[PDB]
Enzyme design. Structure first.
Site, mmCIF file in Angstrom:
data_model
loop_
_atom_site.group_PDB
_atom_site.id
_atom_site.type_symbol
_atom_site.label_atom_id
_atom_site.label_comp_id
_atom_site.label_asym_id
_atom_site.label_seq_id
_atom_site.Cartn_x
_atom_site.Cartn_y
_atom_site.Cartn_z
ATOM 1 N N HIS A 1 -2.274 10.658 3.201
ATOM 2 C CA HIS A 1 -0.812 10.010 3.895
ATOM 3 C C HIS A 1 0.114 10.405 2.564
ATOM 4 C CE1 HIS A 1 1.692 6.702 4.559
ATOM 5 N NE2 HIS A 1 2.105 6.671 3.581
ATOM 6 N N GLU A 2 -0.507 10.496 1.267
ATOM 7 C CA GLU A 2 0.405 10.836 0.119
ATOM 8 C C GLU A 2 1.062 12.208 0.208
ATOM 9 O OE1 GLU A 2 1.846 8.402 -1.573
ATOM 10 O OE2 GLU A 2 0.425 6.918 -1.124
ATOM 11 N N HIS B 1 4.085 12.777 2.258
ATOM 12 C CA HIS B 1 5.059 12.606 1.459
ATOM 13 C C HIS B 1 5.535 13.835 0.487
ATOM 14 C CE1 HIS B 1 5.448 8.364 2.896
ATOM 15 N NE2 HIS B 1 4.759 8.119 2.079
ATOM 16 N N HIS C 1 8.035 7.571 6.400
ATOM 17 C CA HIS C 1 7.270 6.977 7.194
ATOM 18 C C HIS C 1 7.616 6.875 8.619
ATOM 19 C CE1 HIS C 1 6.071 4.379 3.469
ATOM 20 N NE2 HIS C 1 5.124 4.881 3.891
#
Ligand SMILES: [Ca+2]
Ligand SMILES: [Ca+2]
Ligand SMILES: [Ca+2]
Ligand SMILES: [Zn+2]
Length: 168
Positions: A119-120, A123, A129
């Site tokens: 998930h990181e 980014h 998101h």
């Protein structure tokens, strides 16, 4: 899916990463396998390629950190914020920090390192998101994702491809 504003993206296809330090929670080999799998999630659906560095300044510097750690965004002790990561760009941008007040695990018995890493890295590559609740990039991904059958959602693929296109 969503992007950061001004759509920061990397302007090259080959990215370096470096694992700066290691959590006491797991064997070093598990931290490495976890980052590698997290990187491959995104590699698999774009023209991006990654290599590891052991000295120097890599695009995506990965570290474990507690409380104040030398950026303006201190971690909060156990639970809540698990990890944070900066959008594409020079220096601290692109980098990802992991709160060591979590118990990092390779399974689902604590905070799963792979899942939060993927998930990181989302980014670090330029994805913000998602409004879609089964996307990896949905902010609650951590509570809602089943591990044995993990599959990047179409919303994630649509998102990262809008930035880097589909693989060759
Ligand atoms: Ca960086
Ligand atoms: Ca925390
Ligand atoms: Ca820990
Ligand atoms: Zn930080």
């Amino acid at each position: 899916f969503r992007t950061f504003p001004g759509i920061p993206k990397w302007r090259k296809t080959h990215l370096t990463y470096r694992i700066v330090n290691y959590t006491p929670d797991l064997p070093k080999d598990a931290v490495d396998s976890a980052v590698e799998k997290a990187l491959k999630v995104w590699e698999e659906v774009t023209p991006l390629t990654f290599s590891r560095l052991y000295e120097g300044e890599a695009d995506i510097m990965i570290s474990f950190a507690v409380r104040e750690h030398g950026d303006f965004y201190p971690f909060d002790g156990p639970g809540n914020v698990l990890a944070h990561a900066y959008a594409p760009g020079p220096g601290i941008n692109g980098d990802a920090h992991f709160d060591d007040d979590e118990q990092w695990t390779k399974d689902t018995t604590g905070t799963n390192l792979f899942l939060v890493a993927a998930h990181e890295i989302g980014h670090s590559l330029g994805l913000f998101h998602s409004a879609n609740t089964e996307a990896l990039m949905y902010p609650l991904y951590h509570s809602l994702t089943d591990l044995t059958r993990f599959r990047l959602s179409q919303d994630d693929i649509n998102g990262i491809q809008s930035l880097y296109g589909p693989p060759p």
